[PDB]
PDB file of all heavy atoms in Angstrom:
ATOM      1  N   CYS A   3       1.003  33.820 -34.367  1.00  0.00           N
ATOM      2  CA  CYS A   3       1.473  35.141 -34.197  1.00  0.00           C
ATOM      3  C   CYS A   3       2.905  35.224 -33.730  1.00  0.00           C
ATOM      4  O   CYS A   3       3.260  35.973 -32.850  1.00  0.00           O
ATOM      5  CB  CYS A   3       0.498  35.852 -33.292  1.00  0.00           C
ATOM      6  SG  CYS A   3       0.677  37.664 -33.182  1.00  0.00           S
ATOM      7  N   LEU A  19       6.732  40.573 -29.092  1.00  0.00           N
ATOM      8  CA  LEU A  19       5.938  41.583 -28.581  1.00  0.00           C
ATOM      9  C   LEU A  19       4.665  41.042 -27.958  1.00  0.00           C
ATOM     10  O   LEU A  19       4.100  39.975 -28.379  1.00  0.00           O
ATOM     11  CB  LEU A  19       5.560  42.667 -29.614  1.00  0.00           C
ATOM     12  CG  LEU A  19       4.344  42.485 -30.529  1.00  0.00           C
ATOM     13  CD1 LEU A  19       3.926  43.653 -31.166  1.00  0.00           C
ATOM     14  CD2 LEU A  19       4.635  41.307 -31.617  1.00  0.00           C
ATOM     15  N   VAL A  20       4.088  41.715 -27.023  1.00  0.00           N
ATOM     16  CA  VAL A  20       2.805  41.391 -26.402  1.00  0.00           C
ATOM     17  C   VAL A  20       2.268  42.592 -25.709  1.00  0.00           C
ATOM     18  O   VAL A  20       2.917  43.243 -25.006  1.00  0.00           O
ATOM     19  CB  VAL A  20       2.984  40.125 -25.523  1.00  0.00           C
ATOM     20  CG1 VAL A  20       4.156  40.212 -24.522  1.00  0.00           C
ATOM     21  CG2 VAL A  20       1.670  39.884 -24.741  1.00  0.00           C
ATOM     22  N   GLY A  21       0.963  42.921 -25.893  1.00  0.00           N
ATOM     23  CA  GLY A  21       0.433  44.033 -25.201  1.00  0.00           C
ATOM     24  C   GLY A  21       0.994  45.405 -25.553  1.00  0.00           C
ATOM     25  O   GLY A  21       0.743  45.976 -26.547  1.00  0.00           O
ATOM     26  N   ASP A  22       1.806  45.902 -24.691  1.00  0.00           N
ATOM     27  CA  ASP A  22       2.423  47.162 -24.793  1.00  0.00           C
ATOM     28  C   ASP A  22       3.887  47.080 -24.857  1.00  0.00           C
ATOM     29  O   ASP A  22       4.589  48.058 -25.006  1.00  0.00           O
ATOM     30  CB  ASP A  22       1.932  48.065 -23.627  1.00  0.00           C
ATOM     31  CG  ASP A  22       1.907  47.283 -22.264  1.00  0.00           C
ATOM     32  OD1 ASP A  22       2.799  46.407 -22.143  1.00  0.00           O
ATOM     33  OD2 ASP A  22       1.112  47.583 -21.394  1.00  0.00           O
ATOM     34  N   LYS A  23       4.533  45.930 -24.613  1.00  0.00           N
ATOM     35  CA  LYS A  23       5.929  45.825 -24.498  1.00  0.00           C
ATOM     36  C   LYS A  23       6.411  44.553 -25.285  1.00  0.00           C
ATOM     37  O   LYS A  23       5.932  43.531 -25.252  1.00  0.00           O
ATOM     38  CB  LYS A  23       6.383  45.691 -23.071  1.00  0.00           C
ATOM     39  CG  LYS A  23       5.972  46.733 -21.996  1.00  0.00           C
ATOM     40  CD  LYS A  23       6.597  48.030 -22.407  1.00  0.00           C
ATOM     41  CE  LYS A  23       7.993  48.249 -21.627  1.00  0.00           C
ATOM     42  NZ  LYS A  23       8.633  49.543 -22.018  1.00  0.00           N
ATOM     43  N   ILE A  57       6.877  48.377 -26.950  1.00  0.00           N
ATOM     44  CA  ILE A  57       6.304  48.171 -28.326  1.00  0.00           C
ATOM     45  C   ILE A  57       6.248  49.446 -29.081  1.00  0.00           C
ATOM     46  O   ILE A  57       5.778  50.395 -28.567  1.00  0.00           O
ATOM     47  CB  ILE A  57       4.900  47.564 -28.294  1.00  0.00           C
ATOM     48  CG1 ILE A  57       4.979  45.991 -28.084  1.00  0.00           C
ATOM     49  CG2 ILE A  57       4.056  47.816 -29.560  1.00  0.00           C
ATOM     50  CD1 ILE A  57       3.721  45.378 -27.905  1.00  0.00           C
ATOM     51  N   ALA A  65       0.021  43.971 -33.378  1.00  0.00           N
ATOM     52  CA  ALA A  65       0.178  43.607 -31.963  1.00  0.00           C
ATOM     53  C   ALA A  65      -0.124  42.150 -31.779  1.00  0.00           C
ATOM     54  O   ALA A  65      -0.410  41.379 -32.668  1.00  0.00           O
ATOM     55  CB  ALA A  65      -0.752  44.478 -31.084  1.00  0.00           C
ATOM     56  N   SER A  66      -0.098  41.794 -30.457  1.00  0.00           N
ATOM     57  CA  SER A  66      -0.334  40.387 -30.046  1.00  0.00           C
ATOM     58  C   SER A  66      -1.065  40.309 -28.763  1.00  0.00           C
ATOM     59  O   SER A  66      -0.522  40.764 -27.666  1.00  0.00           O
ATOM     60  CB  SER A  66       0.940  39.564 -29.993  1.00  0.00           C
ATOM     61  OG  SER A  66       1.911  40.305 -29.388  1.00  0.00           O
ATOM     62  N   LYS A  67      -2.307  39.768 -28.734  1.00  0.00           N
ATOM     63  CA  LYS A  67      -3.067  39.757 -27.541  1.00  0.00           C
ATOM     64  C   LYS A  67      -2.727  38.523 -26.675  1.00  0.00           C
ATOM     65  O   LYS A  67      -2.007  37.644 -27.103  1.00  0.00           O
ATOM     66  CB  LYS A  67      -4.689  39.639 -27.879  1.00  0.00           C
ATOM     67  CG  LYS A  67      -5.447  40.556 -26.918  1.00  0.00           C
ATOM     68  CD  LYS A  67      -6.925  40.492 -27.362  1.00  0.00           C
ATOM     69  CE  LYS A  67      -7.897  41.365 -26.308  1.00  0.00           C
ATOM     70  NZ  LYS A  67      -9.249  41.228 -26.614  1.00  0.00           N
ATOM     71  N   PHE A  68      -3.267  38.560 -25.511  1.00  0.00           N
ATOM     72  CA  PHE A  68      -2.883  37.612 -24.439  1.00  0.00           C
ATOM     73  C   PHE A  68      -3.850  37.644 -23.335  1.00  0.00           C
ATOM     74  O   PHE A  68      -4.926  38.419 -23.400  1.00  0.00           O
ATOM     75  CB  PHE A  68      -1.499  37.986 -23.836  1.00  0.00           C
ATOM     76  CG  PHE A  68      -1.539  39.131 -22.981  1.00  0.00           C
ATOM     77  CD1 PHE A  68      -1.346  38.971 -21.600  1.00  0.00           C
ATOM     78  CD2 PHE A  68      -1.740  40.372 -23.443  1.00  0.00           C
ATOM     79  CE1 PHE A  68      -1.358  40.024 -20.729  1.00  0.00           C
ATOM     80  CE2 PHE A  68      -1.869  41.494 -22.613  1.00  0.00           C
ATOM     81  CZ  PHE A  68      -1.567  41.370 -21.256  1.00  0.00           C
ATOM     82  N   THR A  69      -3.714  36.873 -22.274  1.00  0.00           N
ATOM     83  CA  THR A  69      -4.464  37.065 -21.135  1.00  0.00           C
ATOM     84  C   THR A  69      -3.805  36.492 -19.866  1.00  0.00           C
ATOM     85  O   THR A  69      -2.566  36.076 -20.073  1.00  0.00           O
ATOM     86  CB  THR A  69      -5.851  36.327 -21.129  1.00  0.00           C
ATOM     87  OG1 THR A  69      -6.656  36.695 -19.933  1.00  0.00           O
ATOM     88  CG2 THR A  69      -5.696  34.792 -21.215  1.00  0.00           C
ATOM     89  N   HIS A  70      -4.278  36.519 -18.692  1.00  0.00           N
ATOM     90  CA  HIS A  70      -3.717  35.873 -17.513  1.00  0.00           C
ATOM     91  C   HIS A  70      -4.744  34.873 -16.975  1.00  0.00           C
ATOM     92  O   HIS A  70      -4.833  34.665 -15.754  1.00  0.00           O
ATOM     93  CB  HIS A  70      -3.470  36.977 -16.524  1.00  0.00           C
ATOM     94  CG  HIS A  70      -4.564  37.770 -16.085  1.00  0.00           C
ATOM     95  ND1 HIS A  70      -5.578  37.399 -15.104  1.00  0.00           N
ATOM     96  CD2 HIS A  70      -5.029  39.008 -16.455  1.00  0.00           C
ATOM     97  CE1 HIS A  70      -6.394  38.244 -14.863  1.00  0.00           C
ATOM     98  NE2 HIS A  70      -6.162  39.342 -15.749  1.00  0.00           N
ATOM     99  N   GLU A  71      -5.330  34.013 -17.879  1.00  0.00           N
ATOM    100  CA  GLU A  71      -6.262  32.969 -17.424  1.00  0.00           C
ATOM    101  C   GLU A  71      -5.440  31.679 -17.434  1.00  0.00           C
ATOM    102  O   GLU A  71      -5.015  31.263 -18.508  1.00  0.00           O
ATOM    103  CB  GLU A  71      -7.502  32.927 -18.375  1.00  0.00           C
ATOM    104  CG  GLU A  71      -8.202  34.213 -18.478  1.00  0.00           C
ATOM    105  CD  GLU A  71      -8.565  34.739 -17.086  1.00  0.00           C
ATOM    106  OE1 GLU A  71      -9.179  34.007 -16.352  1.00  0.00           O
ATOM    107  OE2 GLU A  71      -8.240  35.884 -16.808  1.00  0.00           O
ATOM    108  N   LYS A  72      -5.465  30.975 -16.391  1.00  0.00           N
ATOM    109  CA  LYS A  72      -4.744  29.718 -16.087  1.00  0.00           C
ATOM    110  C   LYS A  72      -5.604  28.560 -15.698  1.00  0.00           C
ATOM    111  O   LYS A  72      -5.712  28.277 -14.575  1.00  0.00           O
ATOM    112  CB  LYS A  72      -3.452  29.857 -15.257  1.00  0.00           C
ATOM    113  CG  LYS A  72      -2.565  30.957 -15.569  1.00  0.00           C
ATOM    114  CD  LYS A  72      -2.786  32.314 -14.755  1.00  0.00           C
ATOM    115  CE  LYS A  72      -1.915  33.356 -15.266  1.00  0.00           C
ATOM    116  NZ  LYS A  72      -2.140  34.676 -14.457  1.00  0.00           N
ATOM    117  N   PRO A 106       7.217  32.156 -25.944  1.00  0.00           N
ATOM    118  CA  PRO A 106       5.713  32.410 -25.812  1.00  0.00           C
ATOM    119  C   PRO A 106       4.928  31.139 -25.802  1.00  0.00           C
ATOM    120  O   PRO A 106       4.589  30.546 -26.906  1.00  0.00           O
ATOM    121  CB  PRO A 106       5.426  33.343 -27.004  1.00  0.00           C
ATOM    122  CG  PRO A 106       6.519  33.023 -27.976  1.00  0.00           C
ATOM    123  CD  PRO A 106       7.708  32.653 -27.219  1.00  0.00           C
ATOM    124  N   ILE A 107       4.485  30.725 -24.667  1.00  0.00           N
ATOM    125  CA  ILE A 107       3.290  29.755 -24.626  1.00  0.00           C
ATOM    126  C   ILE A 107       2.032  30.481 -24.736  1.00  0.00           C
ATOM    127  O   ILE A 107       1.983  31.548 -24.047  1.00  0.00           O
ATOM    128  CB  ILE A 107       3.519  28.844 -23.391  1.00  0.00           C
ATOM    129  CG1 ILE A 107       2.372  27.887 -23.222  1.00  0.00           C
ATOM    130  CG2 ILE A 107       3.766  29.621 -22.122  1.00  0.00           C
ATOM    131  CD1 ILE A 107       2.312  26.798 -24.286  1.00  0.00           C
ATOM    132  N   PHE A 108       1.061  29.896 -25.383  1.00  0.00           N
ATOM    133  CA  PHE A 108      -0.214  30.603 -25.496  1.00  0.00           C
ATOM    134  C   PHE A 108      -1.235  29.627 -25.102  1.00  0.00           C
ATOM    135  O   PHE A 108      -0.967  28.518 -24.659  1.00  0.00           O
ATOM    136  CB  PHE A 108      -0.402  31.145 -26.941  1.00  0.00           C
ATOM    137  CG  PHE A 108      -0.075  30.124 -28.068  1.00  0.00           C
ATOM    138  CD1 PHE A 108      -1.037  29.349 -28.524  1.00  0.00           C
ATOM    139  CD2 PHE A 108       1.220  30.056 -28.635  1.00  0.00           C
ATOM    140  CE1 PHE A 108      -0.720  28.369 -29.578  1.00  0.00           C
ATOM    141  CE2 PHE A 108       1.492  29.251 -29.624  1.00  0.00           C
ATOM    142  CZ  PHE A 108       0.490  28.370 -30.120  1.00  0.00           C
ATOM    143  N   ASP A 109      -2.489  30.067 -25.163  1.00  0.00           N
ATOM    144  CA  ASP A 109      -3.642  29.255 -24.808  1.00  0.00           C
ATOM    145  C   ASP A 109      -4.010  28.294 -25.783  1.00  0.00           C
ATOM    146  O   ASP A 109      -3.331  28.073 -26.796  1.00  0.00           O
ATOM    147  CB  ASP A 109      -4.821  30.206 -24.272  1.00  0.00           C
ATOM    148  CG  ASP A 109      -5.315  31.132 -25.410  1.00  0.00           C
ATOM    149  OD1 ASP A 109      -4.702  31.182 -26.443  1.00  0.00           O
ATOM    150  OD2 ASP A 109      -6.368  31.870 -25.160  1.00  0.00           O
ATOM    151  N   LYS A 111      -6.312  29.001 -27.978  1.00  0.00           N
ATOM    152  CA  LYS A 111      -6.615  29.771 -29.177  1.00  0.00           C
ATOM    153  C   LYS A 111      -5.835  30.865 -29.594  1.00  0.00           C
ATOM    154  O   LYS A 111      -6.170  31.749 -30.340  1.00  0.00           O
ATOM    155  CB  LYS A 111      -8.134  30.215 -28.891  1.00  0.00           C
ATOM    156  CG  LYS A 111      -8.247  31.348 -27.863  1.00  0.00           C
ATOM    157  CD  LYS A 111      -9.586  31.862 -27.588  1.00  0.00           C
ATOM    158  CE  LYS A 111      -9.572  33.005 -26.713  1.00  0.00           C
ATOM    159  NZ  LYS A 111      -8.831  34.144 -27.475  1.00  0.00           N
ATOM    160  N   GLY A 112      -4.590  30.993 -28.973  1.00  0.00           N
ATOM    161  CA  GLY A 112      -3.765  32.012 -29.483  1.00  0.00           C
ATOM    162  C   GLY A 112      -3.767  33.335 -28.549  1.00  0.00           C
ATOM    163  O   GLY A 112      -3.936  34.415 -29.137  1.00  0.00           O
ATOM    164  N   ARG A 113      -3.520  33.136 -27.331  1.00  0.00           N
ATOM    165  CA  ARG A 113      -3.397  34.265 -26.471  1.00  0.00           C
ATOM    166  C   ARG A 113      -2.333  33.850 -25.396  1.00  0.00           C
ATOM    167  O   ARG A 113      -2.409  32.809 -24.768  1.00  0.00           O
ATOM    168  CB  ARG A 113      -4.649  34.575 -25.667  1.00  0.00           C
ATOM    169  CG  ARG A 113      -5.484  35.717 -26.348  1.00  0.00           C
ATOM    170  CD  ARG A 113      -6.700  35.947 -25.544  1.00  0.00           C
ATOM    171  NE  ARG A 113      -7.207  34.727 -25.025  1.00  0.00           N
ATOM    172  CZ  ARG A 113      -8.033  34.607 -23.935  1.00  0.00           C
ATOM    173  NH1 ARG A 113      -8.324  35.564 -23.287  1.00  0.00           N
ATOM    174  NH2 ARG A 113      -8.421  33.381 -23.561  1.00  0.00           N
ATOM    175  N   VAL A 114      -1.251  34.683 -25.251  1.00  0.00           N
ATOM    176  CA  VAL A 114      -0.024  34.381 -24.571  1.00  0.00           C
ATOM    177  C   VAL A 114      -0.325  34.196 -23.037  1.00  0.00           C
ATOM    178  O   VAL A 114      -0.862  35.162 -22.418  1.00  0.00           O
ATOM    179  CB  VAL A 114       1.105  35.381 -24.831  1.00  0.00           C
ATOM    180  CG1 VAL A 114       2.375  35.026 -24.198  1.00  0.00           C
ATOM    181  CG2 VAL A 114       1.290  35.460 -26.345  1.00  0.00           C
ATOM    182  N   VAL A 115       0.094  33.138 -22.475  1.00  0.00           N
ATOM    183  CA  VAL A 115      -0.203  32.850 -21.100  1.00  0.00           C
ATOM    184  C   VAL A 115       0.967  32.994 -20.069  1.00  0.00           C
ATOM    185  O   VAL A 115       0.741  33.445 -18.992  1.00  0.00           O
ATOM    186  CB  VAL A 115      -0.738  31.332 -21.001  1.00  0.00           C
ATOM    187  CG1 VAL A 115      -2.113  31.315 -21.728  1.00  0.00           C
ATOM    188  CG2 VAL A 115       0.171  30.357 -21.620  1.00  0.00           C
ATOM    189  N   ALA A 116       2.190  32.693 -20.626  1.00  0.00           N
ATOM    190  CA  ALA A 116       3.390  32.689 -19.668  1.00  0.00           C
ATOM    191  C   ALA A 116       4.586  32.796 -20.428  1.00  0.00           C
ATOM    192  O   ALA A 116       4.608  32.770 -21.759  1.00  0.00           O
ATOM    193  CB  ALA A 116       3.327  31.355 -18.864  1.00  0.00           C
ATOM    194  N   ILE A 117       5.732  32.962 -19.810  1.00  0.00           N
ATOM    195  CA  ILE A 117       7.107  33.117 -20.396  1.00  0.00           C
ATOM    196  C   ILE A 117       8.063  32.258 -19.666  1.00  0.00           C
ATOM    197  O   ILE A 117       8.266  32.544 -18.388  1.00  0.00           O
ATOM    198  CB  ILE A 117       7.515  34.528 -20.488  1.00  0.00           C
ATOM    199  CG1 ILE A 117       6.825  35.276 -21.710  1.00  0.00           C
ATOM    200  CG2 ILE A 117       8.960  34.725 -20.702  1.00  0.00           C
ATOM    201  CD1 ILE A 117       7.216  34.531 -23.084  1.00  0.00           C
ATOM    202  N   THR A 134       5.362  34.922 -14.890  1.00  0.00           N
ATOM    203  CA  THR A 134       3.978  35.089 -15.319  1.00  0.00           C
ATOM    204  C   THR A 134       3.546  36.544 -14.839  1.00  0.00           C
ATOM    205  O   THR A 134       4.327  37.302 -14.315  1.00  0.00           O
ATOM    206  CB  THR A 134       3.038  34.055 -14.680  1.00  0.00           C
ATOM    207  OG1 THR A 134       1.701  34.428 -14.962  1.00  0.00           O
ATOM    208  CG2 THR A 134       3.178  34.142 -13.116  1.00  0.00           C
ATOM    209  N   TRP A 135       2.193  36.743 -15.013  1.00  0.00           N
ATOM    210  CA  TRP A 135       1.563  38.043 -14.694  1.00  0.00           C
ATOM    211  C   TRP A 135       0.185  37.702 -14.166  1.00  0.00           C
ATOM    212  O   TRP A 135      -0.789  37.665 -14.958  1.00  0.00           O
ATOM    213  CB  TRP A 135       1.561  38.917 -15.907  1.00  0.00           C
ATOM    214  CG  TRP A 135       1.340  38.180 -17.238  1.00  0.00           C
ATOM    215  CD1 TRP A 135       0.104  37.917 -17.868  1.00  0.00           C
ATOM    216  CD2 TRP A 135       2.304  37.563 -18.083  1.00  0.00           C
ATOM    217  NE1 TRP A 135       0.172  37.208 -18.977  1.00  0.00           N
ATOM    218  CE2 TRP A 135       1.579  36.978 -19.113  1.00  0.00           C
ATOM    219  CE3 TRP A 135       3.605  37.395 -18.078  1.00  0.00           C
ATOM    220  CZ2 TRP A 135       2.215  36.241 -20.160  1.00  0.00           C
ATOM    221  CZ3 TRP A 135       4.235  36.742 -19.021  1.00  0.00           C
ATOM    222  CH2 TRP A 135       3.536  36.171 -20.109  1.00  0.00           C
ATOM    223  N   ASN A 136       0.020  37.708 -12.883  1.00  0.00           N
ATOM    224  CA  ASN A 136      -1.273  37.421 -12.321  1.00  0.00           C
ATOM    225  C   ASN A 136      -2.040  38.789 -12.241  1.00  0.00           C
ATOM    226  O   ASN A 136      -1.445  39.684 -11.583  1.00  0.00           O
ATOM    227  CB  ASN A 136      -1.180  36.683 -10.978  1.00  0.00           C
ATOM    228  CG  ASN A 136      -0.618  37.481  -9.818  1.00  0.00           C
ATOM    229  OD1 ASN A 136       0.444  38.132 -10.019  1.00  0.00           O
ATOM    230  ND2 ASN A 136      -1.224  37.469  -8.685  1.00  0.00           N
ATOM    231  N   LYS A 137      -3.223  38.785 -12.774  1.00  0.00           N
ATOM    232  CA  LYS A 137      -3.955  40.046 -13.106  1.00  0.00           C
ATOM    233  C   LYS A 137      -3.119  41.233 -13.542  1.00  0.00           C
ATOM    234  O   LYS A 137      -3.155  42.299 -13.177  1.00  0.00           O
ATOM    235  CB  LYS A 137      -4.893  40.432 -11.911  1.00  0.00           C
ATOM    236  CG  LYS A 137      -4.399  40.677 -10.441  1.00  0.00           C
ATOM    237  CD  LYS A 137      -4.198  42.183 -10.200  1.00  0.00           C
ATOM    238  CE  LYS A 137      -3.745  42.351  -8.664  1.00  0.00           C
ATOM    239  NZ  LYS A 137      -3.535  43.875  -8.469  1.00  0.00           N
ATOM    240  N   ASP A 138      -2.157  40.846 -14.425  1.00  0.00           N
ATOM    241  CA  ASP A 138      -1.166  41.714 -15.081  1.00  0.00           C
ATOM    242  C   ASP A 138      -0.253  42.204 -13.832  1.00  0.00           C
ATOM    243  O   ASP A 138      -0.022  43.373 -13.700  1.00  0.00           O
ATOM    244  CB  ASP A 138      -1.655  42.851 -15.817  1.00  0.00           C
ATOM    245  CG  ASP A 138      -0.525  43.459 -16.710  1.00  0.00           C
ATOM    246  OD1 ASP A 138      -0.166  42.860 -17.725  1.00  0.00           O
ATOM    247  OD2 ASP A 138      -0.107  44.585 -16.401  1.00  0.00           O
ATOM    248  N   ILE A 139       0.298  41.325 -13.099  1.00  0.00           N
ATOM    249  CA  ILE A 139       1.281  41.594 -12.125  1.00  0.00           C
ATOM    250  C   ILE A 139       2.351  40.525 -12.157  1.00  0.00           C
ATOM    251  O   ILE A 139       2.160  39.312 -12.006  1.00  0.00           O
ATOM    252  CB  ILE A 139       0.674  41.581 -10.688  1.00  0.00           C
ATOM    253  CG1 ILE A 139      -0.336  42.673 -10.370  1.00  0.00           C
ATOM    254  CG2 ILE A 139       1.756  41.582  -9.605  1.00  0.00           C
ATOM    255  CD1 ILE A 139       0.240  44.033 -10.471  1.00  0.00           C
ATOM    256  N   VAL A 140       3.551  40.889 -12.482  1.00  0.00           N
ATOM    257  CA  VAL A 140       4.508  40.016 -13.036  1.00  0.00           C
ATOM    258  C   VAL A 140       5.297  39.451 -11.921  1.00  0.00           C
ATOM    259  O   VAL A 140       5.611  40.194 -10.921  1.00  0.00           O
ATOM    260  CB  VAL A 140       5.462  40.653 -14.033  1.00  0.00           C
ATOM    261  CG1 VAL A 140       4.717  40.916 -15.396  1.00  0.00           C
ATOM    262  CG2 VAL A 140       6.029  41.930 -13.513  1.00  0.00           C
TER     263      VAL A 140
ATOM    264  N   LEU C 398       7.956  44.886 -17.503  1.00  0.00           N
ATOM    265  CA  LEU C 398       7.567  44.420 -18.808  1.00  0.00           C
ATOM    266  C   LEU C 398       6.011  43.920 -18.687  1.00  0.00           C
ATOM    267  O   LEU C 398       5.703  43.013 -19.480  1.00  0.00           O
ATOM    268  CB  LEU C 398       8.411  43.317 -19.374  1.00  0.00           C
ATOM    269  CG  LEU C 398       9.754  43.681 -20.121  1.00  0.00           C
ATOM    270  CD1 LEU C 398      10.525  42.377 -20.362  1.00  0.00           C
ATOM    271  CD2 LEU C 398       9.426  44.251 -21.522  1.00  0.00           C
ATOM    272  N   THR C 399       5.318  44.497 -17.718  1.00  0.00           N
ATOM    273  CA  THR C 399       3.941  44.148 -17.453  1.00  0.00           C
ATOM    274  C   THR C 399       3.104  44.244 -18.523  1.00  0.00           C
ATOM    275  O   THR C 399       2.855  45.319 -19.163  1.00  0.00           O
ATOM    276  CB  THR C 399       3.569  45.058 -16.262  1.00  0.00           C
ATOM    277  OG1 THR C 399       3.968  46.492 -16.613  1.00  0.00           O
ATOM    278  CG2 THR C 399       4.070  44.698 -14.991  1.00  0.00           C
ATOM    279  N   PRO C 400       2.632  43.054 -19.102  1.00  0.00           N
ATOM    280  CA  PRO C 400       2.064  43.107 -20.546  1.00  0.00           C
ATOM    281  C   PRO C 400       0.724  43.754 -20.728  1.00  0.00           C
ATOM    282  O   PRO C 400       0.293  43.828 -21.809  1.00  0.00           O
ATOM    283  CB  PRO C 400       1.966  41.488 -20.755  1.00  0.00           C
ATOM    284  CG  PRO C 400       1.999  40.880 -19.457  1.00  0.00           C
ATOM    285  CD  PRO C 400       2.717  41.763 -18.543  1.00  0.00           C
ATOM    286  N   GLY C 401       0.212  44.344 -19.594  1.00  0.00           N
ATOM    287  CA  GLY C 401      -0.913  45.308 -19.704  1.00  0.00           C
ATOM    288  C   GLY C 401      -0.526  46.564 -19.036  1.00  0.00           C
ATOM    289  O   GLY C 401      -1.180  47.603 -19.339  1.00  0.00           O
ATOM    290  N   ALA C 402       0.424  46.454 -18.116  1.00  0.00           N
ATOM    291  CA  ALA C 402       0.993  47.563 -17.382  1.00  0.00           C
ATOM    292  C   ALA C 402      -0.073  48.483 -16.653  1.00  0.00           C
ATOM    293  O   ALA C 402      -0.108  49.540 -16.619  1.00  0.00           O
ATOM    294  CB  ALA C 402       1.747  48.483 -18.303  1.00  0.00           C
ATOM    295  N   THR C 403      -1.079  47.544 -16.005  1.00  0.00           N
ATOM    296  CA  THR C 403      -2.214  48.214 -15.442  1.00  0.00           C
ATOM    297  C   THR C 403      -1.987  48.928 -14.188  1.00  0.00           C
ATOM    298  O   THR C 403      -1.108  48.600 -13.473  1.00  0.00           O
ATOM    299  CB  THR C 403      -3.270  47.066 -15.162  1.00  0.00           C
ATOM    300  OG1 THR C 403      -3.185  46.221 -16.344  1.00  0.00           O
ATOM    301  CG2 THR C 403      -4.663  47.692 -15.193  1.00  0.00           C
TER     302      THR C 403
END
Side-chain angles (χ1 to χ4, degrees):
Chain A
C3 190
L19 85 162
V20 46
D22 41 35
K23 299 299 265 180
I57 278 175
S66 42
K67 220 177 179 184
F68 78 108
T69 185
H70 58 84
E71 305 305 310
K72 304 103 183 176
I107 177 66
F108 46 92
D109 59 351
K111 68 179 192 62
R113 264 181 322 160
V114 180
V115 296
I117 280 297
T134 178
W135 38 93
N136 68 315
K137 57 102 177 178
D138 196 75
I139 294 295
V140 290
Chain C
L398 273 172
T399 42
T403 319

